[PDB]
Paper text:
Contractile bacteriophages of the family Myoviridae (i.e. T4), R-type pyocins and the type VI secretion system (T6SS) of Gram-negative bacteria are evolutionarily related nano-scale injection machines that puncture target cell membranes using a shared contraction mechanism. [name] subunits are enigmatic as they possess a conserved N-terminal region of unknown function, previously identified as ImpA_N (PFAM: PF0681226), whereas sequences located C-terminal to this region are highly divergent. Consistent with this, phylogenetic analysis has suggested that the [name] family can be subdivided into three clades (TssA1, TssA2 and TssA3). The structural studies presented here show that TssA1B, TssA2A and TssA2B possess structurally diverse CTDs that lead to distinct overall architectures for their respective complexes.
Numbering used by the authors:
A (entry chain A): 302 to 358
B (entry chain B): 302 to 354
The structure:
């Protein structure tokens, strides 16, 4: 019974933290971490970095 | 508040269910589901399977 997205993300981040702490090098740690990065407006940041890199239009 | 592994796996599964339902077939749903699948794989299995040639 997870009610909203904000709470789902917090909980995803807590799970990633746990597995990082107890099984740092596992698949489950790696995937949970990548899931967490995909939960957090990641196309915005990426585009910004692509543009910064081109330097111009 | 995460106090044992079984509980981390349950939270992980519930997160997978939430993103599956709300943002089906998004990167987050896929990765969280896949993490939930691989959470039950023991060390003696994944240590070889990750680098199977």
């Amino acid at each position: 019974h997870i009610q909203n997205r904000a709470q789902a993300v917090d909980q995803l981040r807590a799970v990633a933290r746990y597995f990082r702490q107890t099984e740092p090098h596992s698949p489950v740690a790696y995937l949970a971490d990548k899931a967490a990065e995909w939960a957090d407006m990641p196309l915005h940041k990426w585009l910004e970095s692509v543009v910064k890199d081109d330097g111009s239009l």
